Design a protein around this nucleic acid. Sequence first.
DNA 1: GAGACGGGCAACC
DNA 2: ATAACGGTTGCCCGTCTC
Length: 993
Amino acid sequence: VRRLETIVEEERRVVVQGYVFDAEVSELKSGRTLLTMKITDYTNSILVKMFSRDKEDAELMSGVKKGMWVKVRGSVQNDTFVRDLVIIANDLNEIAANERQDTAPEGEKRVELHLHTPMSQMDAVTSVTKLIEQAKKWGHPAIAVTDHAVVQSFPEAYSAAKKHGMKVIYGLEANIVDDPFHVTLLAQNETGLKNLFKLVSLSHIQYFHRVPRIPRSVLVKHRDGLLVGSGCDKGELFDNVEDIARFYDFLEVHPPDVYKPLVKDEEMIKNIIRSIVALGEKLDIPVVATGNVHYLNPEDKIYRKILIHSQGGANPLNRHELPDVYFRTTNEMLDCFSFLGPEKAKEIVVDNTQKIASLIGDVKPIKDELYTPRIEGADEEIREMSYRRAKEIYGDPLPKLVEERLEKELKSIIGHGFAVIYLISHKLVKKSLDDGYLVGSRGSVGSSFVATMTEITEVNPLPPHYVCPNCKHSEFFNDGSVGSGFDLPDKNCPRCGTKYKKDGHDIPFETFLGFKGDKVPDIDLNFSGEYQPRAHNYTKVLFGEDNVYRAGTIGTVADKTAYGFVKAYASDHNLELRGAEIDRLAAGCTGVKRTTGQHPGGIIVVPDYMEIYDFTPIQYPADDTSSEWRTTHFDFHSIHDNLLKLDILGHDDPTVIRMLQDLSGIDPKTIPTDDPDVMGIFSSTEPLGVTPEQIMCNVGTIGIPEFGTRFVRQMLEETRPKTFSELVQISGLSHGTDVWLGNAQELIQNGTCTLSEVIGCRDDIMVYLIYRGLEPSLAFKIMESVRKGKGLTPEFEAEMRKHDVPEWYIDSCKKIKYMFPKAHAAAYVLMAVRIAYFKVHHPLLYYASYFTVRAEDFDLDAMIKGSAAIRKRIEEINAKGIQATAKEKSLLTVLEVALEMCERGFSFKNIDLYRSQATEFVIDGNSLIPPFNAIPGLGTNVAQAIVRAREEGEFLSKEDLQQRGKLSKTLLEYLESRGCLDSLPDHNQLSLF
DNA sequence: GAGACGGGCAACC
DNA sequence: ATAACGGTTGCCCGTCTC
Ligand SMILES: Nc1nc2c(ncn2[C@H]2C[C@H](O)[C@@H](COP(=O)(O)OP(=O)(O)OP(=O)(O)O)O2)c(=O)[nH]1
Ligand SMILES: [Mn+2]
Ligand SMILES: [Mn+2]
Ligand SMILES: [Mn+2]
Ligand SMILES: [Zn+2]
């Protein structure tokens, strides 16, 4: 039975063992089945192949799963396609994992009080879940989490705690300075927990030096509910007579192996530990044998070695070798300390360890309920705001329909505590417009007519209808025959004679708040990217400085980074590893925390009767002490259910269409949603006056948000939508894995249902299930499950069958990995059609706005040369297929629209010293003049400088241009070589003040 | 050795 | 071409320059 690291050449016959971390099965022309596994025994890894000799073995083959352990007998061969050695197995048997066992008697078990999770930045490696589970298996009555300077594992620890019925001790290894050493803080109770959240806050904010730290006095102020331990060899006392020590509730000692970095010798460690045993007995302080865990098993050590190594000589823990700091069993812990004799061993490994655990109560680090803000007037204001606005549109008294929608909507929004955020959202939007920036609608608030009446969304969710902007007469349609009011033919009010308005997308309110009202949604707004910061800052003014926080993110190592680390470590160490072994080393590094950052726009709101520390510590993103905002230490996900979020997001749509308006004078609200020439671009190139061959595309949506994509254009080719609601159906199925491909598309092509019967937004699932007779709350629960790609539970299936839901519909729900709410789809389409209006009727305005706002990757020389030059660049990139770099893909996207622009008759001029702007493509006759910042290397800063300079006074020489325009040599040549500078002398033979 | 700039990556909607 | 979810903010780190 051979260890994998000893498999080095081709060989007729080996027996080998390992954890299978990947396994796929496939059929061969012959009818034979092939099993392809990757296994590791943790000394190395290897790919295993097996060829079935009968259908019995073939299906057994399908039973081999990730997580099994397997013994394989077979031959070692060079596989020339996979480019590695590989086992061809003739024999396979599942075996027990037979893992490290904890052999001490029940109730006589150890407790781990000093332990690191992957949240100890780049420093520990085994998830807190695995660790907690291992503890349960071993029978430990408790386990502590004590990450460096942070508590970012608390949320996962709690979950695992509840799942596994394990008692977790919520801790912190902190940096203390005297007014820089390690102490262990264990929280006994909620007072202690809150103090931890406070400490981690102050250490990251008021007291961050090069590292978060806590002055000892600040610790004392916040000590209540904490037990304090002396911790590592980087601890205060280990680093040396007695007063220092009496400061602690328990005294830490690590297995001698842990201290092996060396002090003078190995005998000194053994004595020092004794000097600490002596100290603790003398002072009646419990002495505890803690392990300083950084990973589960002894061999998991390599993953840590790889991470740390990635940080260069800029770490100085690469100086010496790394200690064995895996999770030690109670019996093996006794062994490490046998040298103190059997009574002390048992005292400090178990009795005291258990005793400390027993001084710890049952703490819940994350709350169960939602805390909702209060601001006087809010409930009442939202009520009057919406009844008044509705009445002025729909008349007094209101139509029954409208009236019932308000009554039902308001009692829910108010009762579940959402009126405040509706109102704040209204104010955010209103300030943005006053400030000159329109706002794009988004997300599920559009399901709410109250949201519509409060101008928090442009989406009107009522059934399709006509309303008169004059006399205000209505006509609604519930036949369900009409998809959205936007599809209606223009029509005049059969009363006052005046031209009808059309609206209503028939969206159920419950997509937003559900039925119990026990879901916690947010409100999503698309502010322009230019403006987003300002909307953020306005919430400080509205709620008060200390009642909002930007959601913080935790940046972990994912696949691409892990592979990078592993390869570089291989390279540096002169290892040639098999593919399979690179994979598994990579997989061992993922999940480890690397940085912190900022949620892309969510502001978390603290009710005035609570405080942030009831929920999470706070800090600076990436520890930037100059940052304008403080972030939550926990991410939004961890506290999703406790506090409302305002998704104040950034987006190009609002900026693009704002510029389209500032350039044309046209009010985008007056743009028609059934202009045949505009809607034609969603299925043809006719409206654009160009040939498909001319622009390398069969439909007219190049550059249109969402619809200009290659995947989506193809969908459009085969679905040919003309209608607003048909476009809405496409929006829905063009977003999310397994919605269209291998699902809806197959269903239409099969004949099993029509394009309009396929599941195209999460709302349709709910509405259909209600129709089919299921209980609305359950129909809602099922909708929410599938749109998060959680599939269906056995109960859901049973309820569905019981009510005659066809087997294809059930199966289609199980596939969907993600899905829009209709209100998002309608918002986005509305925006897409407005822009389209410009693409058709004001082409050059459309392109100026495109290249100014959306584009960041250019081939200017190609673009200037024109059609043929662009086409050639495009073909160069097409040739690389899916092996194109993101950057090539970003480029391709913009070139596609450039070529279209040229074909439509327009063109690009060279950079122009006196007409080029800083960041905006300007219109000149039938051309765009590119801005300075389009030049590779020339960022926004210089661009603006060049413009500022020339406004101060013309350039008098290439040299004058160079100095006052702050241009590097390289960029000066860029302009030079293109003839931009020909009209100027190199330098001036005179200069005056 | 400080600061602009862009690529590559991760988180999130 | 194949298969294909689209679009946004933000952080780190290497490169090039003055
Ligand atoms: N294309 C795409 N769009 C997304 C994705 N996730 C979210 N969005 C867009 C569509 C969503 O309606 C909106 C996301 O906002 P949220 O995360 O707040 O979800 P939503 O509002 O749909 O549900 P909620 O009522 O808040 O639970 O932004 C995604 O994975 N792909
Ligand atoms: Mn330490
Ligand atoms: Mn430690
Ligand atoms: Mn939302
Ligand atoms: Zn009328």
